[PDB]
Each structure stands twice: as structure tokens, then as C-alpha cells.
Amino acid sequence: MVKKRLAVLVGCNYPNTRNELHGCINDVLAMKETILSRFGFKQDDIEVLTDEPESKVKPTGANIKAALRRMVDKAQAGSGDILFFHYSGHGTRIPSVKSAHPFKQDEAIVPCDFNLITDVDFRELVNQLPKGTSFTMISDSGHSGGLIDKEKEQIGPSSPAIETTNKTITSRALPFKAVLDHLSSLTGITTSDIGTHLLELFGRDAGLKFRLPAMDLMDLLETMTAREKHVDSGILMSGCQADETSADVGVGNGKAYGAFSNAIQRVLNENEGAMKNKQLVMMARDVLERLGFHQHPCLYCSDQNADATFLSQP
């Protein structure tokens, strides 16, 4: 029977804004060519969401989640379907509770409309996938470590210094105050509660963290914790740790790129044969370390998926 290979590629350069980046769209275009030529993906099975001014499908929070949900629509049980999601753009960290002095923080990505997609949103996404399928997520963004909440850390801070790179770099992380101020410019509300702005602007399209009552979220987290005891289909390759940022390398000359995304491309160009998920992250860490980048890519997946081939390459 046919095995499906679906991909959603998101790149946010935020052009002509206060948080402009330059290498995110190039990351998407390079990753599209890689999966088309090496990993058996087909053009009709790849959705690209980039925010260049002439783009007809912008990487908004609703458009990203709808494209990911279209992938969940086609994944079948016992099929071994291969789902891929690449994100290059800004990341951020938000309070875990509705307080100005939270004890812990949640990781999130920043779509072009700032409709934040947090780690609990990606945890619900991978829990919608049947057993035997794989969802490989490469997030070249700041604070990308832990973007799939409760996904087991395989490579990370719990599992001689090189000179800093001479490349011209820019951080792919936005401070929480900058994200809050961006949303306040649209609502006009005077509050530090970022959930109030997101519910106000996007309603049902807001993240799970902001639209669900505390009782419904706890119950939802308990059902996911129960299912994760038997099914674990999520694979996250982050560009940095939860407390780090990811580097945007270059200037606005058309050749900028993400440091982590480029490190992945370098490893693939030098190793044409099939390689495990954990070996790809380890060799990507080696490339960034020798090149003078201080971000540490991480891997989050089950023990079995750590030994599985990246994108199930034959």
C-alpha cells in the first residue's frame, strides 16, 4: 500500500517590520528542494507558507494550524505515513499562568500575525496522530527547545570554548514585552495578560493555552499524558535550547540563512546515505560548534524514533 509523505514549510521574515529577519524564506526554499530530491516528497504534497509581500497564503497562526491539520486529515493508522513540518522564524517564551511573575514559562513560535502557537498546541497536534506514523518538526527559531510539550528529551541540557563566529548574525527570538506590545497595538487593551489579547484578536483561532478554561486544559493535559504512555509519534529537532536563541545569518542581500537550517543542509550534503534522527542532530551540533555558533540544537522524541531514519529515507 501507498505510504504518504506530507510536508508543511513555514518561513517568517517579517519584512518591513520592527522584527525583520532575512534567512527564514531561504531556509524553506532549501528544505523544499531537499525533501523533493532526497526524501521522496512530491510537489503536490508540500504546502509552503511564507510572508513575502506578494505571498498569497501568509503564515498566520490560523493558516499554519490549518495546514498542519490538513496533514492530520491524511495520516492513517498502520500506514507509516511521514509528516514533516519546518519552521524558520521568531520564537518567544510566555508565562505559564495568568500572572506577571510566573514560576515557569512556555515556548512558542511567532506567526506573521503574532497569533502565538505554543508548546501545548504542538503537543495536542502530535497526540492526534495514529500509532505508527511520524511527525518530524524542525524549528529553526529562538527558544525552540521543548516546542512539543512533554516530548522526551533525547539530546539536550539534561541528556574548550570555540571563538564566536565572525558571521553577521541576528537573533530569532522576540522578548515577551515586544510580542505583548505588538498585540496591544491591535486591541488597545491595557493588560499584561497576553491571553486576553490573543482571545480578543483571534477567538477560536487562538492557542489552546488562551481559549480553554483552566479545568478543560487540565483535563486535556491528563488525556494526553495518558495517551503518551502508549503512543509517541512526535519528533522535534530544535535549533537551540529552551533558554537560548537561534541565529539568523547574513544580511538582506538574498543569501541569508538560518544557522541551524544551514547546518542540517551541510550534514546532508556530506552524508548522502540514510542516517538516524539522533545522528543528524549530533552532527548538526558539531557543525555549529566548530563554526563558532553557541546555540545547541536539541532532539525530542521516543527512544525508538531516535534510532529511526530521518524522514524514513531508504
Tab-separated table of C-alpha atoms in Angstrom:
chain	number	residue	atom	x	y	z
A	1	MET	CA	0.000	0.000	0.000
A	2	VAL	CA	0.986	3.613	-0.643
A	3	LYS	CA	2.841	5.497	2.094
A	4	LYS	CA	2.136	9.227	2.226
A	5	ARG	CA	4.833	11.895	2.576
A	6	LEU	CA	3.325	15.254	3.551
A	7	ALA	CA	5.135	18.485	4.376
A	8	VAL	CA	4.290	21.953	5.678
A	9	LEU	CA	7.057	24.550	5.325
A	10	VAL	CA	6.726	27.883	7.140
A	11	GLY	CA	9.091	30.837	6.857
A	12	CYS	CA	8.582	34.226	8.523
A	13	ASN	CA	10.903	37.057	7.502
A	14	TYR	CA	8.546	39.749	8.863
A	15	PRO	CA	9.567	42.141	6.059
A	16	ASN	CA	9.219	45.895	6.615
A	17	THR	CA	8.547	45.446	10.348
A	18	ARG	CA	10.416	46.058	13.600
A	19	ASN	CA	11.359	42.358	13.860
A	20	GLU	CA	12.660	41.765	10.336
A	21	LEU	CA	14.579	38.583	9.511
A	22	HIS	CA	16.318	37.652	6.264
A	23	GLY	CA	17.086	33.921	6.131
A	24	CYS	CA	13.814	32.206	7.005
A	25	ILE	CA	12.338	32.059	3.495
A	26	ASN	CA	15.672	30.815	2.136
A	27	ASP	CA	15.569	28.031	4.735
A	28	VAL	CA	12.146	26.979	3.436
A	29	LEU	CA	13.196	27.018	-0.223
A	30	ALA	CA	16.328	24.989	0.536
A	31	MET	CA	14.395	22.461	2.628
A	32	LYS	CA	11.758	22.091	-0.101
A	33	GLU	CA	14.420	21.165	-2.661
A	34	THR	CA	15.988	18.697	-0.212
A	35	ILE	CA	12.836	16.687	0.524
A	36	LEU	CA	11.843	16.729	-3.160
A	37	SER	CA	15.182	15.343	-4.363
A	38	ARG	CA	16.309	13.084	-1.494
A	39	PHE	CA	13.341	12.106	0.703
A	40	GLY	CA	10.763	11.181	-1.936
A	41	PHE	CA	8.320	14.035	-1.346
A	42	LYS	CA	6.070	15.236	-4.166
A	43	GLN	CA	5.296	18.848	-5.047
A	44	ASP	CA	1.526	18.465	-4.612
A	45	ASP	CA	2.062	17.166	-1.051
A	46	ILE	CA	4.069	20.215	0.117
A	47	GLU	CA	2.420	23.380	1.440
A	48	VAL	CA	4.627	26.480	1.664
A	49	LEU	CA	3.610	29.402	3.896
A	50	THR	CA	5.982	32.371	3.622
A	51	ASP	CA	5.349	36.046	4.354
A	52	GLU	CA	6.951	37.838	1.420
A	53	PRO	CA	4.845	40.866	0.389
A	54	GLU	CA	3.473	39.169	-2.748
A	55	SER	CA	2.572	35.922	-0.957
A	56	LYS	CA	-0.977	34.670	-1.493
A	57	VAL	CA	-1.002	32.380	1.581
A	58	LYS	CA	0.579	34.079	4.603
A	59	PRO	CA	1.935	32.071	7.578
A	60	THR	CA	-0.672	33.347	10.014
A	61	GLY	CA	-1.490	31.417	13.169
A	62	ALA	CA	-4.727	30.128	11.654
A	63	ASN	CA	-3.160	29.259	8.290
A	64	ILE	CA	-0.273	27.353	9.893
A	65	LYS	CA	-2.544	25.276	12.130
A	66	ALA	CA	-4.942	24.615	9.241
A	67	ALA	CA	-2.087	23.339	7.064
A	68	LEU	CA	-0.877	21.116	9.903
A	69	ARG	CA	-4.442	19.869	10.414
A	70	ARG	CA	-4.714	19.039	6.714
A	71	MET	CA	-1.751	16.742	7.327
A	72	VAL	CA	-3.562	15.194	10.296
A	73	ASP	CA	-6.518	14.632	7.934
A	74	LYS	CA	-4.457	12.314	5.705
A	75	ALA	CA	-2.479	10.339	8.312
A	76	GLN	CA	-3.844	6.791	8.586
A	77	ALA	CA	-3.326	4.113	11.223
A	78	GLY	CA	-0.927	1.312	10.318
A	79	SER	CA	0.208	3.158	7.184
A	80	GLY	CA	3.556	4.512	8.356
A	81	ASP	CA	2.783	7.935	6.886
A	82	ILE	CA	5.569	10.517	7.076
A	83	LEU	CA	4.672	14.066	8.124
A	84	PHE	CA	7.208	16.900	8.058
A	85	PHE	CA	6.987	20.441	9.433
A	86	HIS	CA	9.756	23.019	9.032
A	87	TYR	CA	9.541	26.419	10.719
A	88	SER	CA	12.001	29.291	10.343
A	89	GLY	CA	11.059	32.478	12.161
A	90	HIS	CA	10.834	34.178	15.529
A	91	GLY	CA	10.228	32.344	18.787
A	92	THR	CA	9.340	33.564	22.261
A	93	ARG	CA	8.566	32.479	25.819
A	94	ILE	CA	5.347	33.302	27.672
A	95	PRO	CA	4.151	32.958	31.277
A	96	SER	CA	2.634	29.564	32.046
A	97	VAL	CA	-0.106	31.107	34.229
A	98	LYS	CA	-2.036	34.382	34.139
A	99	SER	CA	0.416	36.306	36.297
A	100	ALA	CA	3.098	38.942	35.808
A	101	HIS	CA	5.617	36.826	37.778
A	102	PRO	CA	5.205	33.246	36.523
A	103	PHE	CA	7.120	30.373	38.064
A	104	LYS	CA	7.650	28.554	34.738
A	105	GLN	CA	7.406	29.547	31.069
A	106	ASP	CA	6.037	28.069	27.842
A	107	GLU	CA	7.771	28.043	24.459
A	108	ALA	CA	6.076	29.294	21.305
A	109	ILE	CA	6.602	30.299	17.689
A	110	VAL	CA	5.575	33.683	16.313
A	111	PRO	CA	3.465	33.601	13.123
A	112	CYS	CA	3.413	36.696	10.940
A	113	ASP	CA	0.201	37.878	12.650
A	114	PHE	CA	1.591	37.075	16.142
A	115	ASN	CA	-1.164	34.503	16.793
A	116	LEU	CA	1.182	32.516	19.007
A	117	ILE	CA	1.362	28.730	18.684
A	118	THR	CA	2.674	27.374	21.981
A	119	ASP	CA	4.134	24.065	23.137
A	120	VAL	CA	0.735	22.787	24.278
A	121	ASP	CA	-0.629	23.363	20.761
A	122	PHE	CA	2.046	21.122	19.240
A	123	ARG	CA	1.510	18.542	21.990
A	124	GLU	CA	-2.172	18.307	21.045
A	125	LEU	CA	-1.186	18.062	17.376
A	126	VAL	CA	1.089	15.039	17.772
A	127	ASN	CA	-1.495	13.373	20.035
A	128	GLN	CA	-3.980	13.497	17.129
A	129	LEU	CA	-1.723	11.205	15.060
A	130	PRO	CA	-2.281	7.435	14.993
A	131	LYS	CA	0.326	4.947	16.129
A	132	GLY	CA	2.955	4.034	13.553
A	133	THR	CA	3.149	7.496	11.961
A	134	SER	CA	5.929	10.056	12.335
A	135	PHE	CA	5.725	13.843	12.686
A	136	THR	CA	9.200	15.335	12.217
A	137	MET	CA	9.387	19.005	13.220
A	138	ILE	CA	12.443	21.169	12.517
A	139	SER	CA	12.039	24.555	14.221
A	140	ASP	CA	14.872	26.971	13.395
A	141	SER	CA	13.668	29.575	15.877
A	142	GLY	CA	14.601	31.085	19.212
A	143	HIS	CA	13.572	29.158	22.334
A	144	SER	CA	12.654	26.235	20.073
A	145	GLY	CA	13.716	23.589	22.598
A	146	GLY	CA	10.634	21.983	24.101
A	147	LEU	CA	8.170	23.169	21.446
A	148	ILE	CA	6.471	19.759	21.692
A	149	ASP	CA	5.481	19.800	25.353
A	150	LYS	CA	6.318	16.675	27.399
A	151	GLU	CA	8.191	15.150	24.448
A	152	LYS	CA	11.096	13.167	25.880
A	153	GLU	CA	14.444	14.930	25.542
A	154	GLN	CA	16.973	12.744	23.711
A	155	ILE	CA	19.634	15.418	23.114
A	156	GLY	CA	19.702	18.475	25.351
A	157	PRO	CA	20.901	20.106	28.572
A	158	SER	CA	19.632	17.208	30.724
A	159	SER	CA	20.666	14.356	28.404
A	160	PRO	CA	37.189	24.061	25.242
A	161	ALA	CA	35.354	27.163	24.024
A	162	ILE	CA	35.347	27.906	20.293
A	163	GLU	CA	35.774	31.510	19.173
A	164	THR	CA	32.488	33.227	18.351
A	165	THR	CA	31.594	33.192	14.659
A	166	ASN	CA	32.713	36.162	12.571
A	167	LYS	CA	29.475	35.980	10.573
A	168	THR	CA	26.930	38.782	10.799
A	169	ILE	CA	24.082	37.317	12.857
A	170	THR	CA	20.683	38.303	14.238
A	171	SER	CA	18.608	36.641	16.952
A	172	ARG	CA	15.454	34.714	16.023
A	173	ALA	CA	13.860	35.363	19.430
A	174	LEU	CA	11.492	38.150	20.448
A	175	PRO	CA	11.192	39.277	24.080
A	176	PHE	CA	7.793	38.767	25.680
A	177	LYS	CA	7.332	42.534	26.029
A	178	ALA	CA	7.768	43.015	22.273
A	179	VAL	CA	5.125	40.383	21.495
A	180	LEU	CA	2.754	41.882	24.074
A	181	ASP	CA	3.256	45.397	22.688
A	182	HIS	CA	2.603	44.188	19.133
A	183	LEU	CA	-0.728	42.698	20.219
A	184	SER	CA	-1.629	45.791	22.259
A	185	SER	CA	-1.251	47.958	19.143
A	186	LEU	CA	-4.155	45.968	17.646
A	187	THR	CA	-6.506	45.579	20.634
A	188	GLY	CA	-5.938	48.827	22.520
A	189	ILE	CA	-6.467	46.910	25.773
A	190	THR	CA	-4.245	47.841	28.734
A	191	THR	CA	-3.277	44.496	30.255
A	192	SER	CA	-0.208	42.324	30.761
A	193	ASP	CA	-2.312	39.199	30.104
A	194	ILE	CA	-1.195	38.055	26.657
A	195	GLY	CA	-4.088	35.584	26.601
A	196	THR	CA	-6.580	38.448	26.746
A	197	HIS	CA	-5.130	39.981	23.573
A	198	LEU	CA	-4.966	36.665	21.703
A	199	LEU	CA	-8.543	35.685	22.556
A	200	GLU	CA	-9.569	39.221	21.624
A	201	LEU	CA	-7.900	39.214	18.198
A	202	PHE	CA	-8.342	35.598	17.091
A	203	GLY	CA	-11.049	33.970	19.232
A	204	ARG	CA	-11.357	30.270	18.424
A	205	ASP	CA	-8.180	30.553	16.318
A	206	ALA	CA	-6.155	31.423	19.430
A	207	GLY	CA	-3.925	28.834	21.059
A	208	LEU	CA	-5.151	26.120	23.398
A	209	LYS	CA	-3.471	27.845	26.342
A	210	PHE	CA	-5.551	31.012	25.978
A	211	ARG	CA	-9.016	29.818	24.893
A	212	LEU	CA	-9.517	26.897	27.252
A	213	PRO	CA	-10.674	27.311	30.853
A	214	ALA	CA	-8.270	26.007	33.477
A	215	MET	CA	-10.448	22.953	34.140
A	216	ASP	CA	-10.675	21.980	30.469
A	217	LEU	CA	-6.927	22.410	29.970
A	218	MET	CA	-6.072	20.225	32.976
A	219	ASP	CA	-8.463	17.526	31.759
A	220	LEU	CA	-6.964	17.809	28.272
A	221	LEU	CA	-3.422	17.524	29.646
A	222	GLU	CA	-4.423	14.398	31.586
A	223	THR	CA	-5.807	12.702	28.465
A	224	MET	CA	-2.626	13.491	26.531
A	225	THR	CA	-0.427	12.252	29.383
A	226	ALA	CA	-2.445	9.020	29.334
A	227	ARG	CA	-2.158	8.545	25.564
A	228	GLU	CA	1.572	9.376	25.546
A	229	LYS	CA	2.139	6.284	27.709
A	230	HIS	CA	1.376	4.092	24.667
A	231	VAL	CA	1.696	6.315	21.557
A	232	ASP	CA	4.591	8.685	20.797
A	233	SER	CA	4.684	9.974	17.213
A	234	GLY	CA	6.340	13.385	17.684
A	235	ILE	CA	9.914	14.205	16.659
A	236	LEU	CA	11.274	17.700	17.345
A	237	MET	CA	14.635	18.971	16.087
A	238	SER	CA	15.043	22.415	17.644
A	239	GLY	CA	17.598	25.000	16.584
A	240	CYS	CA	18.517	25.815	20.187
A	241	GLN	CA	17.668	25.069	23.803
A	242	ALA	CA	14.569	26.368	25.568
A	243	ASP	CA	16.661	29.137	27.174
A	244	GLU	CA	18.628	30.004	24.010
A	245	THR	CA	18.033	31.756	20.698
A	246	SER	CA	18.750	30.695	17.124
A	247	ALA	CA	20.928	32.730	14.782
A	248	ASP	CA	19.803	34.332	11.527
A	249	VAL	CA	22.996	34.514	9.461
A	250	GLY	CA	23.678	37.196	6.866
A	251	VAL	CA	22.169	40.453	5.656
A	252	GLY	CA	19.332	41.436	3.331
A	253	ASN	CA	21.242	40.533	0.165
A	254	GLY	CA	19.189	37.449	-0.734
A	255	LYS	CA	21.664	34.856	0.588
A	256	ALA	CA	20.866	34.934	4.315
A	257	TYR	CA	20.059	31.665	6.068
A	258	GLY	CA	19.350	30.152	9.453
A	259	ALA	CA	22.411	28.767	11.210
A	260	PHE	CA	20.647	25.559	12.256
A	261	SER	CA	18.863	25.009	8.933
A	262	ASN	CA	22.150	25.511	7.076
A	263	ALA	CA	23.916	23.101	9.437
A	264	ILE	CA	21.297	20.476	8.566
A	265	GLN	CA	21.921	21.089	4.859
A	266	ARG	CA	25.691	20.775	5.328
A	267	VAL	CA	25.343	17.434	7.129
A	268	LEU	CA	23.028	16.111	4.409
A	269	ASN	CA	25.353	17.276	1.623
A	270	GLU	CA	28.268	15.402	3.226
A	271	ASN	CA	26.291	12.244	4.159
A	272	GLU	CA	24.133	11.051	1.262
A	273	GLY	CA	23.161	7.754	2.897
A	274	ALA	CA	20.320	7.267	5.342
A	275	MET	CA	21.045	8.486	8.869
A	276	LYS	CA	19.257	8.240	12.202
A	277	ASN	CA	17.405	11.162	13.765
A	278	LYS	CA	19.827	11.351	16.696
A	279	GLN	CA	22.885	11.270	14.426
A	280	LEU	CA	21.569	14.157	12.311
A	281	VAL	CA	21.135	16.335	15.403
A	282	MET	CA	24.523	15.304	16.815
A	283	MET	CA	26.345	16.134	13.576
A	284	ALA	CA	24.417	19.404	13.268
A	285	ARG	CA	25.621	20.288	16.770
A	286	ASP	CA	29.182	19.516	15.653
A	287	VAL	CA	28.885	21.830	12.638
A	288	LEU	CA	27.535	24.752	14.672
A	289	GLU	CA	30.125	24.216	17.417
A	290	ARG	CA	33.139	24.296	15.089
A	291	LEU	CA	31.672	27.251	13.164
A	292	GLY	CA	31.519	29.365	16.334
A	293	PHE	CA	27.763	29.325	16.957
A	294	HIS	CA	26.791	28.965	20.613
A	295	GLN	CA	23.255	27.640	20.121
A	296	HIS	CA	22.753	23.960	20.959
A	297	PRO	CA	20.234	22.085	18.784
A	298	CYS	CA	18.116	19.590	20.703
A	299	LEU	CA	16.167	16.437	19.864
A	300	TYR	CA	12.842	15.404	21.412
A	301	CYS	CA	11.289	12.038	20.503
A	302	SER	CA	10.818	8.498	21.770
A	303	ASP	CA	13.725	6.091	22.179
A	304	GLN	CA	12.514	4.195	19.105
A	305	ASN	CA	12.291	7.301	16.909
A	306	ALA	CA	15.792	8.356	17.987
A	307	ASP	CA	17.097	5.251	16.186
A	308	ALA	CA	14.701	5.713	13.262
A	309	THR	CA	15.879	7.037	9.914
A	310	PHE	CA	15.422	10.764	9.329
A	311	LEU	CA	12.255	11.154	7.228
A	312	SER	CA	12.364	7.363	6.673
A	313	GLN	CA	14.993	7.612	3.949
A	314	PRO	CA	15.567	4.175	2.327
